[PDB]
Structure 1
Amino acid sequence: TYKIMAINAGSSSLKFQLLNMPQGALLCQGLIERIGLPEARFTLKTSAQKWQETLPIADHHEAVTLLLEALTGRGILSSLQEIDGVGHRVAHGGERFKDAALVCDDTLREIERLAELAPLHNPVNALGIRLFRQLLPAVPAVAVFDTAFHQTLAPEAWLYPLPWRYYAELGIRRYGFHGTSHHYVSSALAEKLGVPLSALRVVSCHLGNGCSVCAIKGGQSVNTSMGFTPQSGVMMGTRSGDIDPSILPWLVEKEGKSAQQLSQLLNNESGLLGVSGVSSDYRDVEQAADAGNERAALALSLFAERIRATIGSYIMQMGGLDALIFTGGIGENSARARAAICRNLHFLGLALDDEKNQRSATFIQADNALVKVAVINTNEELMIARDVMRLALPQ
């Protein structure tokens, strides 16, 4: 039994879980939020209790100190020396990282060089890597990149039909995100089916506040809906996903939009929120729509259609489909979203068993369907913990 800690460091937040490996048992979890601000809050939960306190938190250096102190102060560990490894989420690995990597000085050097591609995540990610290497210097660390799993994409899937200069010089290309989640629920599907993932043609739908679809064939990722940025792909909470690109020059000319206005538009004002006029939250739009809000209804309908269109592209690309996975907050819980997404797919041998779908059972395909349809809770922290074991305790 090994103690692995999963770390996710945001601009003003510190998310953490502590897992007993390899069973994957949650020992504790929690969140430090509004770091550096007033309002700063530290929330920590065990299998048995919850503690929550508002208190000033200077910087991440003080967020990590309070976390480490709480681990022994609450009896969760007898000592900090019981921590066998730490896994850090990293937004963007570029083309350099095909896998998680043991944290060393140059792995840090490179993650920082990649800030130009994830400017609002990668540096704080590396700061967490640095603080824990300072504060827990005897503990080995692994960086786990949200892009790594998509690096098996072939060029005809990641190259945009732009002038070659824009890839070769500027680095513009599809990278895709949610890699850890798609990777985790891919492997979990195959284990639950008792079949090697390399034997399956799989489409995975991560439907949360962020949404992405991924195609997995031969155990590798062969396409995914997010592109150069997590803005793109299907429609999400506040993100538009893919739109006619020629809309954007037209809004610059006709409405005098700055570069950042365009990006606030694409990332914060659109999606469920921009269409429904109600909310970014799926439950809220559904509540509005069920009461008679036609824009909320169309919102939910457009949302299912965008995902259906992406699924269709990837089935075509793989020449078939053996299984469809739903995950994330919407995918794990919304039997109605799953039903709207899965309707009228007899041409694939895909249909849902309504009783199992309403229950969000782990398998929900109809009895005589040829396509397995799985509802799998995603667990990026467990996946991260598994990558720590692999690269930092080969034992």
Structure 2
Amino acid sequence: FPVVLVINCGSSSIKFSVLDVATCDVLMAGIADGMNTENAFLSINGDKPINLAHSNYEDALKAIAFELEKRDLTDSVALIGHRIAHGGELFTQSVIITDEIIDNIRRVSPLAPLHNYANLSGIDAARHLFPAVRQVAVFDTSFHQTLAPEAYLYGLPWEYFSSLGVRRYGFHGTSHRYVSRRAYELLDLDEKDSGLIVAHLGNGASICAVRNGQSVDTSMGMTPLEGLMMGTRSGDVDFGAMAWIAKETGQTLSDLERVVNKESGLLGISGLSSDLRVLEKAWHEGHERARLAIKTFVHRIARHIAGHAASLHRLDGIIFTGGIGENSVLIRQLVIEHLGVLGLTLDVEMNKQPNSHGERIISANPSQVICAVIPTNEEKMIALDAIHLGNVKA
């Protein structure tokens, strides 16, 4: 009974999961939170929040390696999957990790300094503890590599693209890809002749246009700062407005960088929370700024959904996913009502259903476009890639 170990090294954490190869079922999940801090705890499943003090990425992984051996799982680890934040232009698909792959991930790391060096630390650690185990890298960007130049270029001088590599990359690619594959079955569509819009809505949020199985447009840019308004992120913002702010406040690009990334979005407008559960209840209680944050959020989602549809020859479906897309009855309805121009009709009883109902249609029959909720599973997609690459001879 072989298993896949899925690793996601964030800026301050290591989120891991163990999945069965035969069914893709999660057998163990955990998180090594508070990395590089004096208080670094590892909490597997919730059964025991074990503690460590000031420990590196490898030490937190060596803790997992001991825990897995304690539960007799070590010999079952047939494959290891690694989440990579940025694959530049070098990666278009998931690959078996080699010395070449590591060099190439290190080459593109300047495009995402914080996240990518953490991912490499995870690879180096996992390679030490599991040398006899095949290891696979899965990139957040690789799905959007099918974007045409007209879709990924910025209006900046050509020099910045050819010399410095400034262009759209986009993210949530593993989610967008997974949700796409699932949508073709649910909606009974031919992948080779299809047009989908996938709205990934969580703390970080992005839209993606999938034409004939390929990503043709996506809302995030070179960084996760572009596109939709998000939890703490502003989304699309007038650069002239940002420069105007600088003159008045004396703030720098870096100062405003943190503001746009960490203090804006739902949190920024409402002045209350980045969490939608909080804001939805706040609006029901007549909070004005929470209502506006949600309306702004919805308006910007609808605008980008309709905009991304232009990159399609025919619109067959709109798919909601992520913590917000899976669980928010309100946001989904508000977005769909804001897209009556595309001819969407909502089935409210179907939209009322909680996430326990899984992959489900939420649009009425006379709707010109099918609307659906499909729960994303980035861990499963990483595992399915690892399983597929497990048959390869390298």
- The alignment's TM-score, normalised by the length of structure 1, stands at 0.95
Amino acid aligned to 1:282? L
CA deviations on 1:36-85 (whole Å, 9 max, x unpaired) are 3122211112xxx722223325111111111011112134x2xx232111
- Root mean square deviation, CA, Å: 1.5
Mapping of 1:92-111 within 5 angstroms?
Answer: 92-111=86-105
Moved more, 14-23 or 378-387: 14-23
Asked if 1:259 is matched to 2:253, the reply is yes
CA–CA separation in structure 1 for the residues paired with 2:341 and 2:287: 33
* Aligned position for 1:378: 376
Q: Contact between 1:141 and 1:392, CA under 8 Å: does it hold in 2?
A: no
Shift of 1:372: 1.5
Shift of 1:344: 5.2
Amino acid aligned to 1:217? R
Shift of 1:349: 3.2
* Aligned position for 2:114: 120
State the secondary structure of the residue aligned to 2:154. Answer: coil
* Aligned position for 1:53: 50
Within the candidate set 328, 332, 339, 1:338 is matched to: 332
Amino acid aligned to 2:271? G
CA–CA separation in structure 2 for the residues paired with 1:365 and 1:65: 48
Mapping of 1:123-162 within 5 angstroms?
Answer: 123-162=117-156
Mapping of 1:245-324 within 5 angstroms?
Answer: 245-324=239-318
CA deviations on 1:139-170 (whole Å, 9 max, x unpaired) are 11111110000000000000011111110111
Q: State the identity %.
A: 44
State the secondary structure of the residue aligned to 2:78. Answer: strand
CA–CA separation in structure 1 for the residues paired with 2:267 and 2:53: 33
Amino acid aligned to 1:364? I
Amino acid aligned to 1:35? M
Amino acid aligned to 1:105? D
* Aligned position for 2:61: 64
Amino acid aligned to 2:387? M
Amino acid aligned to 2:23? Q
CA deviations on 1:352-388 (whole Å, 9 max, x unpaired) are 1000101145111112223221111110000000111
State the secondary structure of the residue aligned to 2:234. Answer: coil
Aligned residues: 389
Amino acid aligned to 1:169? S
Shift of 1:348: 2.8
* Aligned position for 1:181: 175
Shift of 1:310: 0.3
State the secondary structure of the residue aligned to 2:376. Answer: coil
* Aligned position for 2:13: 13
CA–CA separation in structure 2 for the residues paired with 1:171 and 1:383: 28
CA–CA separation in structure 1 for the residues paired with 2:62 and 2:47: 19
CA–CA separation in structure 2 for the residues paired with 1:235 and 1:247: 16
Mapping of 1:31-42 within 5 angstroms?
Answer: 31-42=31-42
Label 1:94 to 1:344 Cα distance change in 2 as closer, same or farther (>3 A): closer
CA–CA separation in structure 2 for the residues paired with 1:193 and 1:199: 13
Amino acid aligned to 2:68? L
CA deviations on 1:255-303 (whole Å, 9 max, x unpaired) are 2112210101110111001111111111111122221111110110000
State the secondary structure of the residue aligned to 1:198. Answer: coil
State the secondary structure of the residue aligned to 1:222. Answer: strand
CA–CA separation in structure 2 for the residues paired with 1:318 and 1:393: 35
Within the candidate set 356, 361, 364, 2:362 is matched to: 364
CA–CA separation in structure 1 for the residues paired with 2:295 and 2:319: 20
CA–CA separation in structure 1 for the residues paired with 2:157 and 2:53: 50
Structure 1 unaligned regions, length at least 5: none
CA–CA separation in structure 2 for the residues paired with 1:33 and 1:371: 42
Q: Contact between 1:57 and 1:63, CA under 8 Å: does it hold in 2?
A: no
CA–CA separation in structure 2 for the residues paired with 1:115 and 1:163: 23
State the secondary structure of the residue aligned to 1:97. Answer: coil
Amino acid aligned to 2:167? R
Asked if 1:204 is matched to 2:220, the reply is no
Structure 2 unaligned regions, length at least 5: none
CA–CA separation in structure 2 for the residues paired with 1:231 and 1:241: 6
CA–CA separation in structure 2 for the residues paired with 1:392 and 1:12: 30
Shift of 1:307: 0.5
* Aligned position for 1:219: 213
Label 1:276 to 1:104 Cα distance change in 2 as closer, same or farther (>3 A): same
CA–CA separation in structure 1 for the residues paired with 2:173 and 2:208: 9
State the secondary structure of the residue aligned to 1:37. Answer: coil
State the secondary structure of the residue aligned to 1:197. Answer: coil
Q: Contact between 2:39 and 2:54, CA under 8 Å: does it hold in 1?
A: no
* Aligned position for 1:3: 3
